[PDB]
Design an enzyme around this catalytic site. Structure first.
Site, PDB file in Angstrom:
ATOM      1  N   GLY A  18       1.397  -1.260   0.265  1.00  0.00           N
ATOM      2  CA  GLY A  18       0.273  -0.130   0.341  1.00  0.00           C
ATOM      3  C   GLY A  18       0.905   1.261   0.403  1.00  0.00           C
ATOM      4  O   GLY A  18       2.069   1.371   0.556  1.00  0.00           O
ATOM      5  N   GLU A  19       0.633   2.114  -1.013  1.00  0.00           N
ATOM      6  CA  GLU A  19       0.917   3.473  -0.501  1.00  0.00           C
ATOM      7  C   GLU A  19       1.952   3.933  -0.871  1.00  0.00           C
ATOM      8  O   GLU A  19       3.335   4.181  -1.477  1.00  0.00           O
ATOM      9  CB  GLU A  19       1.557   4.372   1.045  1.00  0.00           C
ATOM     10  N   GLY A  21       4.045   1.444  -2.072  1.00  0.00           N
ATOM     11  CA  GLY A  21       4.636   0.304  -1.371  1.00  0.00           C
ATOM     12  C   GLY A  21       5.229  -1.183  -1.465  1.00  0.00           C
ATOM     13  O   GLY A  21       3.555  -1.680  -1.180  1.00  0.00           O
ATOM     14  N   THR A  22       5.574  -1.920  -0.627  1.00  0.00           N
ATOM     15  CA  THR A  22       5.802  -3.337   0.011  1.00  0.00           C
ATOM     16  C   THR A  22       6.288  -3.333   1.603  1.00  0.00           C
ATOM     17  O   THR A  22       6.786  -2.206   1.571  1.00  0.00           O
ATOM     18  CB  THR A  22       6.364  -4.197  -1.092  1.00  0.00           C
ATOM     19  N   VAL A  23       5.751  -3.393   1.963  1.00  0.00           N
ATOM     20  CA  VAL A  23       5.513  -3.682   3.425  1.00  0.00           C
ATOM     21  C   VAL A  23       6.424  -4.775   4.281  1.00  0.00           C
ATOM     22  O   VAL A  23       5.799  -5.926   4.150  1.00  0.00           O
ATOM     23  CB  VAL A  23       4.708  -2.811   4.068  1.00  0.00           C
ATOM     24  N   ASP A 136      -8.125   9.867   5.237  1.00  0.00           N
ATOM     25  CA  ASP A 136      -7.912   8.130   4.718  1.00  0.00           C
ATOM     26  C   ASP A 136      -8.149   7.007   6.007  1.00  0.00           C
ATOM     27  O   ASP A 136      -7.878   6.428   6.634  1.00  0.00           O
ATOM     28  CB  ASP A 136      -6.635   7.447   3.922  1.00  0.00           C
ATOM     29  N   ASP A 154      -0.292   4.926   8.220  1.00  0.00           N
ATOM     30  CA  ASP A 154      -0.923   5.930   6.957  1.00  0.00           C
ATOM     31  C   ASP A 154      -1.123   6.982   7.354  1.00  0.00           C
ATOM     32  O   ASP A 154      -2.854   7.277   6.873  1.00  0.00           O
ATOM     33  CB  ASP A 154      -2.330   4.647   5.524  1.00  0.00           C
TER      34      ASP A 154
HETATM   35  C1  LIG Z   1       3.472   2.488   6.914  1.00  0.00           C
HETATM   36  C2  LIG Z   1       4.734   2.267   7.500  1.00  0.00           C
HETATM   37  C3  LIG Z   1       2.164   1.687   7.322  1.00  0.00           C
HETATM   38  N1  LIG Z   1       2.333   0.733   8.020  1.00  0.00           N
HETATM   39  C4  LIG Z   1       2.418   0.775   8.967  1.00  0.00           C
HETATM   40  O1  LIG Z   1       2.836   1.971   9.820  1.00  0.00           O
HETATM   41  C5  LIG Z   1       2.251  -0.297  10.114  1.00  0.00           C
HETATM   42  C6  LIG Z   1       2.859  -0.914  11.164  1.00  0.00           C
HETATM   43  N2  LIG Z   1       2.568  -2.525  12.280  1.00  0.00           N
HETATM   44  C7  LIG Z   1       1.687  -3.218  10.807  1.00  0.00           C
HETATM   45  N3  LIG Z   1       1.438  -4.407  11.814  1.00  0.00           N
HETATM   46  C8  LIG Z   1       0.982  -5.345  11.020  1.00  0.00           C
HETATM   47  C9  LIG Z   1       1.407  -6.403  10.463  1.00  0.00           C
HETATM   48  C10 LIG Z   1       1.491  -7.991  10.118  1.00  0.00           C
HETATM   49  C11 LIG Z   1       0.275  -7.966   9.047  1.00  0.00           C
HETATM   50  N4  LIG Z   1      -0.069  -8.881   8.535  1.00  0.00           N
HETATM   51  C12 LIG Z   1       0.359 -10.683   9.924  1.00  0.00           C
HETATM   52  C13 LIG Z   1       0.246 -11.515   8.354  1.00  0.00           C
HETATM   53  N5  LIG Z   1      -1.030 -11.392   8.068  1.00  0.00           N
HETATM   54  C14 LIG Z   1      -1.450 -12.376   6.894  1.00  0.00           C
HETATM   55  C15 LIG Z   1      -1.154 -10.308   6.681  1.00  0.00           C
HETATM   56  C16 LIG Z   1      -1.189  -8.628   7.967  1.00  0.00           C
HETATM   57  C17 LIG Z   1      -0.070  -6.524   9.239  1.00  0.00           C
HETATM   58  C18 LIG Z   1       0.737  -5.540   9.782  1.00  0.00           C
HETATM   59  N6  LIG Z   1       1.463  -2.643   9.297  1.00  0.00           N
HETATM   60  C19 LIG Z   1       1.708  -1.658   9.243  1.00  0.00           C
HETATM   61  N7  LIG Z   1       1.894  -0.593   8.022  1.00  0.00           N
HETATM   62  C20 LIG Z   1       0.773  -1.851   7.032  1.00  0.00           C
HETATM   63  C21 LIG Z   1       1.208  -2.941   6.587  1.00  0.00           C
HETATM   64  C22 LIG Z   1       1.010  -3.658   6.095  1.00  0.00           C
HETATM   65  C23 LIG Z   1       0.311  -2.648   4.903  1.00  0.00           C
HETATM   66  C24 LIG Z   1      -0.017  -1.026   4.804  1.00  0.00           C
HETATM   67  C25 LIG Z   1      -0.667  -0.249   4.091  1.00  0.00           C
HETATM   68  C26 LIG Z   1      -1.287  -0.928   3.017  1.00  0.00           C
HETATM   69  C27 LIG Z   1       0.417   0.740   3.619  1.00  0.00           C
HETATM   70  O2  LIG Z   1      -1.720   0.510   4.701  1.00  0.00           O
HETATM   71  N8  LIG Z   1       0.114  -0.822   6.109  1.00  0.00           N
END
Ligand SMILES: *C(=C)Cn1c(=O)c2cnc(Nc3ccc(N4CCN(C)CC4)cc3)nc2n1-c1cccc(C(C)(C)O)n1
Length: 260
Positions: A18-19, A21-23, A136, A154
Site C-alpha cells: 500500500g501507499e 510500496g511493499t511492507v 483516510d 498510513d
Molecule cells: C506504513 C509503514 C504503514 N504501516 C505501518 O506503519 C505499520 C505498522 N504495523 C503494521 N503491522 C502489521 C503486522 C502484520 C500484518 N499482517 C500479518 C500477516 N498477515 C497474513 C497479513 C497482515 C499486518 C500489519 N503494519 C503497518 N503498516 C502497514 C502494513 C501493511 C500494509 C500497509 C498499508 C496498506 C500501506 O497501509 N501498512
C-alpha cells in the site's frame, strides 16, 4: 558495501502492500526489536498534492509520538526509492480482525466497539491538536498491538489544516463535504470516516462504493448492522456521520464522552 536496509535489518516476511510500496516485518540487527518497513515501489517522484510520499514525509515531521498513532522512526532513500520505518504492530489491521470475525460468524460487541472508537479518538485528537488531518480513516489503517491498543497508520493522505493539499481517501469512508471540495472543517471528515469505521467493526455489510446507497449514508443514515446497540451509543455514532459539518463532535469532545 550494501544497502542501509540490508546492513541494518533482517527481512522476516512481507506483510502487505500500500501507499505505492511493499511492507515487510524487519528485525533491526542492533537492538533486536521488530519494525514495519515500507519500500516505495516507485522512484522520486511525481507532482505534489496528489503525492503520497510527500504527505507521509510532511506528516512524520509535524507529528511527534502518540500512543495511538503508529510510531515513526526513520526514513531514507535507496536507488531513488523511499523507505519508511515504523513501529511494528503485532496484531495487524483492524480490518483483518473484522474479516476473521465475520467469516467465523462472530462480531465485535458494543463494549469493544466503544473501546475501538475511544482509543482511535484519542489518536485522532493528537493529530488535530497538531493542526493535521488524516483523510483516510478506515479499518485498513488502524493497527492492533499486543495481539490491547489501536493505532492510526498510513499518513499518505495527511495534510496541514491551515494550507491544505487534499487528495480524497477511500470513497466508502469519504464524507460528501470533502467530495464537494468544502474544506472548511477538514477534521470532521475523519470523524465521519471513524463513524463508518466503527460501523464496519460492529458487523455492517461491505460498504457501498457509489450510487444511492452511498448518497443514502451521507444523509446521516447509519448503515445497517445486524446488531443492536445502546441508542445512547447509537445516537453518538450517527452524530458522527451526520450531514454537514462542524456539528459532528470533535475528537476531544469524543475523548471526553462518558458514553465511551
Ligand atoms: C506504513 C509503514 C504503514 N504501516 C505501518 O506503519 C505499520 C505498522 N504495523 C503494521 N503491522 C502489521 C503486522 C502484520 C500484518 N499482517 C500479518 C500477516 N498477515 C497474513 C497479513 C497482515 C499486518 C500489519 N503494519 C503497518 N503498516 C502497514 C502494513 C501493511 C500494509 C500497509 C498499508 C496498506 C500501506 O497501509 N501498512
Amino acid at each position: 558495501m550494501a544497502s542501509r536496509y540490508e546492513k541494518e535489518f533482517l527481512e522476516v516476511e512481507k506483510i502487505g502492500v500500500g501507499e505505492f510500496g511493499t511492507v515487510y516485518k524487519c528485525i533491526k540487527r542492533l537492538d533486536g526489536c521488530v519494525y514495519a518497513i515500507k519500500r516505495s515501489m516507485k522512484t522520486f517522484t511525481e507532482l505534489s498534492n496528489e503525492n503520497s510520499a510527500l504527505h507521509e514525509v510532511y506528516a512524520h515531521a509535524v507529528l511527534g509520538h502518540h500512543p495511538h498513532v503508529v510510531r515513526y522512526y526513520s526514513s531514507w532513500a535507496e536507488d531513488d526509492h523511499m523507505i519508511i520505518q515504523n513501529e511494528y504492530c503485532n496484531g495487524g489491521s483492524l480490518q483483518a480482525a473484522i474479516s476473521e470475525n465475520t467469516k467465523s460468524g462472530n462480531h465485535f460487541e458494543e463494549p469493544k466497539l466503544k473501546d475501538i472508537l475511544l482509543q482511535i479518538s484519542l489518536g485522532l485528537n493528537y493529530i488535530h491538536n497538531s493542526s493535521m488531518v488524516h483523510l483516510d480513516i478506515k479499518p485498513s489503517n488502524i493497527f492492533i498491538c499486543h495481539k490491547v491498543m489501536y493505532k492510526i497508520g498510513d499518513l499518505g493522505h495527511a495534510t496541514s489544516i491551515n494550507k491544505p493539499k487534499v487528495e480524497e481517501g477511500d470513497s466508502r469512508f469519504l464524507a460528501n463535504e470533502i467530495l464537494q471540495e468544502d474544506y472548511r472543517h477538514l477534521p470532521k471528515a475523519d470523524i465521519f470516516a471513524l463513524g463508518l469505521t466503527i460501523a464496519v467493526a460492529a458487523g455492517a455489510e461491505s460498504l457501498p462504493t457509489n450510487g444511492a446507497a452511498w448518497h443514502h449514508i451521507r444523509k446521516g443514515n447509519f448503515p445497517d448492522v445486524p446488531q443492536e446497540l445502546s441508542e445512547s451509543f447509537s445516537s453518538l455514532l450517527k452524530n458522527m456521520i451526520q450531514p454537514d459539518a462542524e456539528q459532528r463532535p470533535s475528537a476531544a469532545a469524543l475523548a471526553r464522552n462518558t458514553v465511551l
